[PDB]
Amino acid sequence: HMASALIELKNRILAVLNKLSDRDTQQLAVEELERIAQSLSPEGIALFLTCLYDTDSQQKSVVRRECIRLVGTLASIHGDLLASHLPKMVANIVKRLKDPDSNIRDACVESMGVLASSIGSGAVTTVFVKPLFEALAEQHKTLQTGAAMCLARVLECVKEPHPPTLQRLCPRILKMLASPNFLAKASLLSAVGVMVQVPGVVSASQLPVLLGAVQDELGNSEWAVRKAAAEALSCMASAVGNSLVSYRAGVIAALESSRFDKVKPVRDSVTEALQLWKAIYD
């Protein structure tokens, strides 16, 4: 009775998902799919997700771009009633972090924001972050650059950020910054820039350690990692400057050197940061 309804649901969904391939029908098709998603049982949800997870797999770009968006769109329509699926959902977005396609990457980040804001205190935040760390541990660049961007988007969107679980994170970030086989330092630096702006993510006692870590990447030989390092320093200035006044002399000294950098984008970045660290009073 219900089970044959689900087969008929699948049929209706598949019928629309094929309209995502043709480009003139693409938005008709998403609109249809969002309408299908608005009226849906628990079991209809699970079926719908299923369909998204399969069509996710590796066959055309616009299609999996849009299936990733709809994982997001689901979350924002149903909130908590969709909560126990969160792990399969996260797992299925992280899987696509591997594609060296920035359209997919953008979709993946965006959806993770939506998930984080829409769905569900406590170790809800665990179910989002563990997969990203496992991703950052894997040795691919495309993957760890993207997991870095998701990690940022997630922390600034998460509705109820358990600080305890979030504060056990800074140790592993330090470790990834220290290692010289970490392939994504520039993006991970960016993420630190966001994380210090997010109340409750970095305990004040870990800020100084992390400032060291960041300031050391002004000596990296990837110029994009040095640029990112300056930028992260600017972020810590306007965000937590006054928390770090003791270290101010240090940072300005570092940057007074770094501003002579061979590479204009590094100079330009170091310049903004220097002015900002010079601007702290409070």
Coordinates of C-alpha atoms in Angstrom, one line a residue:
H1 CA 0.0 0.0 0.0
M2 CA 2.6 2.6 1.1
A3 CA 5.5 0.6 -0.5
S4 CA 3.9 0.7 -4.0
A5 CA 3.3 4.4 -3.5
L6 CA 7.1 4.8 -3.1
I7 CA 7.7 3.0 -6.4
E8 CA 5.3 5.4 -8.0
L9 CA 7.1 8.3 -6.3
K10 CA 10.4 7.1 -7.6
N11 CA 9.0 7.0 -11.1
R12 CA 7.8 10.6 -10.8
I13 CA 11.1 11.9 -9.5
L14 CA 13.2 10.1 -12.1
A15 CA 11.0 11.7 -14.7
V16 CA 12.0 15.2 -13.6
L17 CA 15.7 14.4 -12.8
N18 CA 16.2 13.7 -16.6
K19 CA 14.9 17.2 -17.3
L20 CA 18.1 18.5 -15.4
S21 CA 20.3 17.2 -18.3
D22 CA 18.6 19.5 -20.9
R23 CA 19.6 23.1 -20.2
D24 CA 16.3 24.8 -21.2
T25 CA 14.4 22.6 -18.8
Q26 CA 16.9 22.8 -16.0
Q27 CA 15.1 25.4 -13.8
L28 CA 11.7 24.0 -14.7
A29 CA 13.1 20.7 -13.3
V30 CA 14.5 22.1 -10.0
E31 CA 11.3 24.0 -9.4
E32 CA 9.3 20.7 -10.0
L33 CA 11.7 18.9 -7.7
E34 CA 11.4 21.5 -4.9
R35 CA 7.6 21.2 -5.2
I36 CA 7.8 17.4 -5.0
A37 CA 10.0 17.9 -1.8
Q38 CA 7.6 20.2 -0.1
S39 CA 4.8 17.6 0.3
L40 CA 6.6 14.4 1.4
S41 CA 6.3 11.8 4.1
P42 CA 9.3 10.6 6.2
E43 CA 9.5 7.7 3.8
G44 CA 9.2 10.0 0.8
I45 CA 12.1 12.0 2.1
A46 CA 14.3 8.9 2.5
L47 CA 13.3 7.9 -1.1
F48 CA 14.1 11.3 -2.5
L49 CA 17.5 11.4 -0.8
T50 CA 18.3 7.9 -2.2
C51 CA 17.6 9.2 -5.6
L52 CA 19.9 12.2 -5.1
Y53 CA 22.7 10.0 -3.7
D54 CA 22.6 7.7 -6.8
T55 CA 22.3 10.5 -9.5
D56 CA 25.1 12.2 -7.5
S57 CA 27.4 9.5 -9.0
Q58 CA 29.9 10.7 -11.6
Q59 CA 28.1 11.0 -14.9
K60 CA 27.2 14.7 -15.7
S61 CA 28.1 18.0 -14.1
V62 CA 25.0 20.2 -14.2
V63 CA 23.1 17.1 -12.9
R64 CA 25.2 16.4 -9.8
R65 CA 25.6 20.1 -9.3
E66 CA 21.8 20.3 -8.9
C67 CA 21.4 17.1 -6.9
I68 CA 23.9 18.5 -4.4
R69 CA 21.8 21.7 -4.2
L70 CA 18.6 19.7 -3.5
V71 CA 20.2 17.8 -0.6
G72 CA 20.5 21.3 0.7
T73 CA 17.0 22.3 -0.3
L74 CA 15.5 19.3 1.5
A75 CA 17.2 20.3 4.8
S76 CA 15.8 23.8 4.6
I77 CA 12.3 22.6 3.9
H78 CA 12.1 20.0 6.8
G79 CA 14.7 21.0 9.4
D80 CA 14.9 18.5 12.3
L81 CA 12.4 16.0 10.8
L82 CA 15.3 15.1 8.5
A83 CA 17.9 14.8 11.2
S84 CA 18.7 11.1 11.5
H85 CA 19.6 11.2 7.7
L86 CA 22.2 13.9 8.3
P87 CA 25.2 11.5 8.3
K88 CA 24.3 9.9 5.0
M89 CA 23.7 13.4 3.6
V90 CA 27.1 14.8 4.8
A91 CA 28.8 11.6 3.6
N92 CA 27.3 12.1 0.2
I93 CA 28.3 15.8 -0.1
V94 CA 31.9 15.1 1.1
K95 CA 32.2 12.3 -1.5
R96 CA 31.8 15.0 -4.2
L97 CA 34.5 17.2 -2.7
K98 CA 36.9 15.1 -4.8
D99 CA 35.8 16.4 -8.1
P100 CA 38.2 19.0 -9.5
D101 CA 35.2 21.0 -10.7
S102 CA 34.7 24.3 -8.8
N103 CA 31.0 24.3 -9.7
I104 CA 30.7 21.1 -7.8
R105 CA 32.9 22.5 -5.0
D106 CA 30.7 25.6 -4.7
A107 CA 27.5 23.5 -4.6
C108 CA 29.1 21.3 -1.9
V109 CA 30.1 24.2 0.3
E110 CA 26.7 25.9 -0.2
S111 CA 24.7 22.8 0.8
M112 CA 26.8 22.2 3.8
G113 CA 25.9 25.8 5.0
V114 CA 22.3 25.1 4.4
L115 CA 22.5 21.8 6.3
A116 CA 24.3 23.3 9.2
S117 CA 21.9 26.2 9.6
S118 CA 18.7 24.2 8.9
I119 CA 19.2 20.9 10.8
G120 CA 19.5 20.6 14.5
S121 CA 22.6 20.8 21.2
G122 CA 25.9 19.1 21.1
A123 CA 27.4 16.4 18.9
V124 CA 25.2 17.3 16.0
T125 CA 28.3 19.5 15.2
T126 CA 30.3 16.3 15.4
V127 CA 28.4 14.7 12.5
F128 CA 29.4 17.6 10.3
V129 CA 33.0 18.0 11.3
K130 CA 34.4 14.4 11.7
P131 CA 33.8 13.6 8.0
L132 CA 35.6 16.9 7.0
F133 CA 38.6 16.1 9.2
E134 CA 38.8 12.6 7.7
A135 CA 38.7 14.3 4.4
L136 CA 41.5 16.7 5.3
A137 CA 43.5 13.8 6.5
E138 CA 43.3 12.1 3.1
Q139 CA 46.2 13.0 0.8
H140 CA 44.3 14.7 -2.1
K141 CA 44.6 18.5 -2.7
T142 CA 41.3 19.0 -4.4
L143 CA 39.6 17.2 -1.5
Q144 CA 41.5 18.9 1.3
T145 CA 41.1 22.4 -0.3
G146 CA 37.4 21.8 -0.4
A147 CA 37.0 20.2 3.0
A148 CA 38.7 23.3 4.3
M149 CA 36.1 25.6 2.7
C150 CA 33.3 23.4 4.0
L151 CA 34.7 23.4 7.5
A152 CA 34.6 27.2 7.4
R153 CA 31.1 27.4 5.9
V154 CA 29.9 24.9 8.5
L155 CA 31.2 26.7 11.6
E156 CA 29.8 30.1 10.6
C157 CA 26.4 28.5 9.8
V158 CA 25.9 25.9 12.5
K159 CA 23.0 27.0 14.7
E160 CA 24.0 25.5 18.0
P161 CA 27.9 25.2 18.1
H162 CA 28.9 23.1 21.1
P163 CA 32.2 24.9 21.9
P164 CA 33.7 21.9 23.8
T165 CA 33.6 19.7 20.8
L166 CA 34.7 22.6 18.5
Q167 CA 37.6 23.5 20.8
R168 CA 39.1 20.0 20.5
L169 CA 39.7 21.0 16.8
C170 CA 42.5 23.6 17.1
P171 CA 45.1 20.8 18.0
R172 CA 44.5 19.1 14.7
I173 CA 44.6 22.4 12.7
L174 CA 48.0 23.3 14.3
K175 CA 49.2 19.8 13.3
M176 CA 48.1 20.2 9.7
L177 CA 49.8 23.7 9.5
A178 CA 53.0 22.2 11.0
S179 CA 53.1 19.2 8.5
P180 CA 54.9 19.9 5.2
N181 CA 52.9 17.2 3.4
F182 CA 49.7 19.2 3.9
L183 CA 48.7 20.3 0.4
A184 CA 46.0 22.9 1.2
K185 CA 47.6 25.4 3.6
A186 CA 46.3 28.4 1.8
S187 CA 42.7 27.3 2.1
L188 CA 43.1 26.0 5.7
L189 CA 44.5 29.5 6.5
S190 CA 41.4 31.2 5.2
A191 CA 39.3 28.8 7.4
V192 CA 41.3 29.9 10.5
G193 CA 40.4 33.5 9.4
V194 CA 36.7 32.6 9.6
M195 CA 37.0 30.4 12.7
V196 CA 38.4 33.2 14.9
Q197 CA 35.5 35.4 13.8
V198 CA 33.0 32.8 15.1
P199 CA 32.1 33.2 18.8
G200 CA 33.0 30.0 20.8
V201 CA 35.2 28.1 18.2
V202 CA 38.6 29.1 19.5
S203 CA 39.2 29.4 23.2
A204 CA 41.2 32.7 24.1
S205 CA 44.0 30.5 25.4
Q206 CA 44.4 28.8 22.0
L207 CA 44.4 32.1 20.1
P208 CA 48.1 33.0 20.8
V209 CA 49.3 29.5 19.8
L210 CA 47.4 29.7 16.6
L211 CA 48.7 33.3 15.9
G212 CA 52.2 31.7 16.0
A213 CA 51.1 29.0 13.6
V214 CA 49.7 31.6 11.3
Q215 CA 52.6 34.0 11.5
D216 CA 55.1 31.2 10.7
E217 CA 53.4 30.7 7.3
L218 CA 54.7 34.1 6.3
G219 CA 57.9 32.1 5.7
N220 CA 56.3 29.6 3.3
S221 CA 57.6 29.4 -0.2
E222 CA 54.2 29.0 -1.8
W223 CA 53.5 32.7 -2.2
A224 CA 49.8 32.0 -2.1
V225 CA 50.3 30.5 1.4
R226 CA 52.1 33.6 2.5
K227 CA 49.4 35.8 1.1
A228 CA 46.8 33.7 3.0
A229 CA 48.9 34.0 6.1
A230 CA 48.8 37.8 6.0
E231 CA 45.0 37.7 5.4
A232 CA 44.4 35.4 8.4
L233 CA 46.5 37.9 10.5
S234 CA 44.2 40.8 9.3
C235 CA 41.2 38.7 10.4
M236 CA 42.6 38.1 13.8
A237 CA 43.3 41.8 14.1
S238 CA 39.8 43.1 13.5
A239 CA 38.2 40.1 15.2
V240 CA 40.3 39.5 18.3
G241 CA 43.0 42.2 18.2
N242 CA 42.4 43.4 21.7
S243 CA 42.6 39.8 23.0
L244 CA 46.1 39.7 21.5
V245 CA 47.6 43.0 22.5
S246 CA 50.6 41.4 24.2
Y247 CA 51.5 39.7 20.9
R248 CA 51.0 43.0 18.9
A249 CA 54.7 43.9 18.9
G250 CA 55.6 40.5 17.7
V251 CA 53.2 40.5 14.7
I252 CA 54.1 44.0 13.6
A253 CA 57.8 43.1 13.6
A254 CA 57.0 40.0 11.5
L255 CA 55.0 42.0 9.1
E256 CA 57.5 44.9 8.9
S257 CA 59.8 42.3 7.3
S258 CA 57.2 40.4 5.3
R259 CA 56.1 43.6 3.4
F260 CA 59.2 43.6 1.2
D261 CA 57.9 40.4 -0.3
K262 CA 58.9 39.7 -4.0
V263 CA 55.2 39.1 -4.8
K264 CA 52.9 42.2 -5.0
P265 CA 49.8 40.2 -3.7
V266 CA 51.8 39.2 -0.7
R267 CA 52.9 42.8 -0.2
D268 CA 49.4 44.2 -0.6
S269 CA 48.1 41.6 1.9
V270 CA 50.9 42.2 4.4
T271 CA 50.2 46.0 4.1
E272 CA 46.5 45.7 5.1
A273 CA 47.4 43.5 8.0
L274 CA 50.1 45.8 9.3
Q275 CA 47.8 48.8 9.4
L276 CA 45.2 46.7 11.2
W277 CA 47.6 45.4 13.9
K278 CA 48.9 48.9 14.2
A279 CA 45.2 50.0 14.7
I280 CA 44.7 48.0 17.9
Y281 CA 44.3 50.1 21.0
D282 CA 41.5 48.6 23.3

